[model samples]
Target: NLYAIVGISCRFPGANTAEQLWNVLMEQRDAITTFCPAENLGFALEENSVFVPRYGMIDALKDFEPSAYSMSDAEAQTIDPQKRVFLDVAADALADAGTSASPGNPLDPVGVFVGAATNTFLSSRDNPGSEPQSFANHYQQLLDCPIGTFASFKLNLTGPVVTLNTACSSALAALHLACASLSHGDCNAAVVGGVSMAYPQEGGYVTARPGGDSSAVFSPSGVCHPLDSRADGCVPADGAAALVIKRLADARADGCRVYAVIEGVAVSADGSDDKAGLGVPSSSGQSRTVEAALRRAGPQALSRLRYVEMHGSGTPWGDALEVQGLKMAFDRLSKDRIYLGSNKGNCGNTEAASGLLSLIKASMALNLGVVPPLPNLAEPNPKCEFEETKFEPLGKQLALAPGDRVGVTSLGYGGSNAHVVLASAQLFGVEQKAFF
Candidate 1:
């Protein structure tokens, strides 16, 4: 009745591979050191300089060899860089799943669901410069190569191809849809992921006031400090992640390795119900969504859970509200200390790719029995009553008890909120295998 994560892959700022990302998490290293130099920032009104010189950036986006995919240079040039990363991670993920997307296989009933945001690459003024730009060319370059159909075409998959654009929750949203497809017998397997990247590769975002738009979610110190009292905002980053998912029974029967089991997933909107504006956080709405996921997972699952991978964007307003919501959701359940942390502090906020990133980290944690620390967190946010609710942020690496379940949460700009419950494969009688 549940979904099994047969394979996983990712490419983040400092980590080109999933194994590298795991090391970055375990070592609590900060990957937000490099960015567009200070000269890139234009002069301010009074000639005073103001630029946050940090971001989680990758170095090899433009280096992907088109010939590897049997595509011409012109054809590959038209593809968005984020989509390029998606293609690489998708292939790697399929291979990690012990299969390839060749034509006509027994795994014929396969689906592709991808989470992508605005195509900033295609919209930049410098795209296809030598070639005269036209609506047709733009359409072919950007719209034509939509992640869902593009991946399906490359892999020769036959089932539905769905692309999601739910802001930050896009990846998890795609994951939720993929699980639904498998449960409904719409497909035997699914490739699900989301990716994000800013154009020009050397651009810095403008800092904003406390209540500015979500695009300005960056700390004044040019670093991400999730769950910290002095946390101002989140730093932007580029990344991609993909997972091969199949029905639990099918995966077990096929001798596939399982990282973790997706016990339940719930998505809801924090509409203008209990909040003042569209982007404002809603404890009630988040609580309802988390409670729904827990109910779907059955009450027994909560008793053993001790950690939650939070949507801790490092913004003061967002982090406080998220913790309050967690307290509200778990108020009646447990008095035991529940640890919370976010990978944003390590690799910066990955936007659409964040949910899948969190899922990947949680899966590793479940398998390895260690809770990664929340890097850059010194003190808890004063607004969050950690003692009263017993919801403490993991300041350093801690060992988790065997069979401990973990919860993952992601909130998007337009109020899309997602929660997923996961447990180690050991809970399902599967031993951990080497993940190299």
Candidate 2:
């Protein structure tokens, strides 16, 4: 209840970093584009559809500098771009949290928790070979430096650092992990976030093979249309995010910009009933995670959890299951009344990084009192019928009041699921600061 957020950072498609991302969100621009990698690879997008083909859609995090945060040139070149994003964002977060990169006394003990499903994808960019099997030899070098080493390398703070790969739920789970570690004296502070970047060629190859909507420009493409009747599927995206956290008292004493307080966090899986398919989402898992989070914060928490920034991957199957999950979780709250939005439409799915980005958006919404709508969406689902439009004002200066609770949830592959309860800083008995 006393953990306080010092700062948050992100580098996503359309926006290279947090400040840039905020600008994009403010301008309401769509980063989703029709990618045709086949054309670049000396083939036609349509022609390759039958054999080793793909939709050619992707969103990348650009203009980031891992070097600024002490990553050696060797590590920077050898690591995956996703790792670079994670390292850069972690550094940015600490800087944003007032933990200056310049060495100083009382440097602050910090822990790190990162969520990533996989490492960088092997592409022609890294290994130009006559055959596709050449780079398989160096796979270990590709997945090097898990989240723990990542944080340690970036900041010289000594504390427990963990790398979580619980599928898509990893980031949300990391948030909870970091918070619990801090509250239970595992660490005085923590740096938690996620990174997701699929290889350019490899990513498209997988999408096309899956026979998903990514094959067509309008059918699926990179546009994420959550809850829309014509929704297709998620587009692959690359990005990273990090949040700096510390005790409420420490944050106040340091004059740091407190984003929100860590009220409570919980995580779980499908809970024995795999309803959709093998390794697919289970309503049991979804409902229980939401319910546990809601209960953790009590009625005030449930009431404050109004805006549901859904895991809108744009897939009809995924969205429908998530909606059912929400209905089951927030019983009697009228799924029709909750405001829901998904960033996957704009930025595509960032895999493990999605939860962190979603959490950042939600916390920003809570702090600033506005919910930006998902991109490329025109209609709402009558079955679910929550406000599925563009960014709308909640009319509350702060989305959470003294003890209002909020939720951040993720449903990932392998039936992995996670949800966390977030409360406004007032719950920790701290004075809120004015935003610049």
Candidate 3:
């Protein structure tokens, strides 16, 4: 049940690197901005009363770097920012996994799953000539999904290199696929993560579409008030995140760095029960996912869960429904012991990257023995309340006793939901010995 954390890295809106992401979380500052070109200038903001700003690379041209991973000259020619991050971050992850172009088994059956949305910015209004391009139309004119291309290009992973587009649940879905591959003996290990380059360059056709609207604003400022009575909408942010998922046995055998153990994973759909109007969040789907995950964990496995990294998008319906699902799942355990926190307040929602970000946060908490507080949460909202659990203040890290387990959930736009449980290495007797 102990999978090594061999390597994990991420790039977020305000936080350029994983280290920066950690700093932002420590500072407990919400990264939401009011510069979304789509919602602000297009339809959502002008139409709705609540206005949520968009966030991205503060300096796209200079801040985002692909050279750290040693990308090739050919791959560097692509102008799509997301693909650039993918290539570099994927390489960084592989290195973190203790695999590289020079690794002994570089050509193993390595699988890759990327949770990505659209390409980088579109340069049509100023140029006017670029408007006829398709989604795959590369700035360098490669005519392919540059995001996915990075998977094959960087690692030479010939197995199931694919992009899963499940809206916000994309990363979680990708994680599920990677875990399945490793469990079934299809691949030795896998690289799973999410990436986004949602900058404010284009006119806003993408964000103008359904489910892209957000009323996200600072009601109390630093907090992301998910399920709160005054909850508005989710702020959109873009970044890249990558992690390595090797079998617990394989990772330990190879003497890799163990972050936390991925004990079990479960995914469910709301396709059949998504009747709450088009483009709205699904409650039944959340309930089904929560139940399915616990069911997959079985009674013994379910009894040990301690922390939950919830998909609290700071929205009205989705946040409340998620809390309901958790209550139904935990039942009596909801007393003061269980802890929950939404890291999106500091990292913002990186679309597909949110799930991995949440997992990374949980891993850090498990290592330090304290769950961070849900920042900006002043008064507890009834919808987000657990019977005996008080929503702890933001940045309050809580330690865990032995046999502790953490759960993370993510729900996407297409009725896709994924739940995963990460057990502490100590619970599974995974010791980190000296590295060679």
Give the best candidate by TM-score.
1
For model 3, state the Cα shift of residue 389 in Å: 6.8
Which pairs clash (backbone N, Cα, C closer than 3 Å) in model 2?
224-345, 301-405, 373-391
What lDDT does each candidate get? Answer: 0.80, 0.64, 0.65
Tell me the TM-score of each prediction against the true structure.
Answer: 0.92, 0.80, 0.81
| Model 2 accuracy (lDDT, Cα) | 0.64
Question: Which parts of model 1 are misplaced by more than 4 Å?
Answer: 40-49, 60-63, 99-105, 130-135, 138-143, 209-215, 332-335
As for candidate 1, its clashing pairs are none
Candidate 3 backbone collisions, by pair:
369-399, 370-397, 370-398, 370-399, 371-397, 371-398, 373-395, 373-396
lDDT of 3 at 85: 70
lDDT of 2 by residue, 82-158 (tens): 66667767877777766422234242578888887676443436623212444645565554667567668666768
Question: What local lDDT does model 1 show for residue 331?
Answer: 76
Superposition error at 409 for model 1 (Å): 0.3
How many clashes show up per model? 0, 3, 8
The true-versus-predicted C-alpha distance at residue 417 of model 1, in Å, is 0.5
What's every prediction's RMSD, in angstroms?
3.0, 5.3, 5.2
Candidate 2 regions with alpha-carbon error over 4 angstroms = 40-75, 99-107, 121-143, 200-219, 249-255, 332-336, 382-405, 426-436
Q: How accurate is candidate 1 locally (lDDT)?
A: 0.80
